[PDB]
Homo-oligomer: A and B are copies of this chain.
Amino acid sequence: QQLPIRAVGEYVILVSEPAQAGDEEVTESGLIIGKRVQGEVPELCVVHSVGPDVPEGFCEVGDLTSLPVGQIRNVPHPFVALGLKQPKEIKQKFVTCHYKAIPCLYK
């Protein structure tokens, strides 16, 4: 899992899971969805890196958790950052958030 990307300070870098609840487009088509609603949607992620300032024993790499879309921020894939590839050809999605935004671990 280790690529050239590390979390600093009190941040934590996670990697989004391939499957998320969105495979239930049960909602009527052509509806306008507000930003609050979109921000509440949970995102299943796996801890990839923990900032050196996150309190010791907070979580561990490999741990699975859930964060609302609105609490996390997308981080450019290290290859795109290191100018090797194009965003489109990257499947893995890295996101970040402050450790205090993490409420649980499916551990």
Q: Which residues of A contact B (CB under 8 A)?
A: 4-11, 13, 19, 21, 23-24, 40, 42, 44, 49, 51-53, 55, 57-59, 64, 66, 68, 73-76, 78, 80-83, 86-87, 96, 99-100, 102-107
Contacts and interface: CB of A to CB of B under 8 A. Distances in A.
Given A80-B21, A103-B75, A8 B59 contact: yes
A99 B19 CA distance: 30
A103 B8 contact: yes
27 contacts: A4-B106, A4-B107, A5-B105, A6-B107, A8-B59, A8-B103, A8-B104, A9-B99, A9-B103, A10-B100, A11-B102, A11-B103, A13-B103, A21-B80, A21-B87, A23-B86, A24-B86, A24-B87, A40-B73, A42-B76, A49-B104, A64-B81, A66-B75, A73-B103, A81-B106, A82-B106, A96-B104
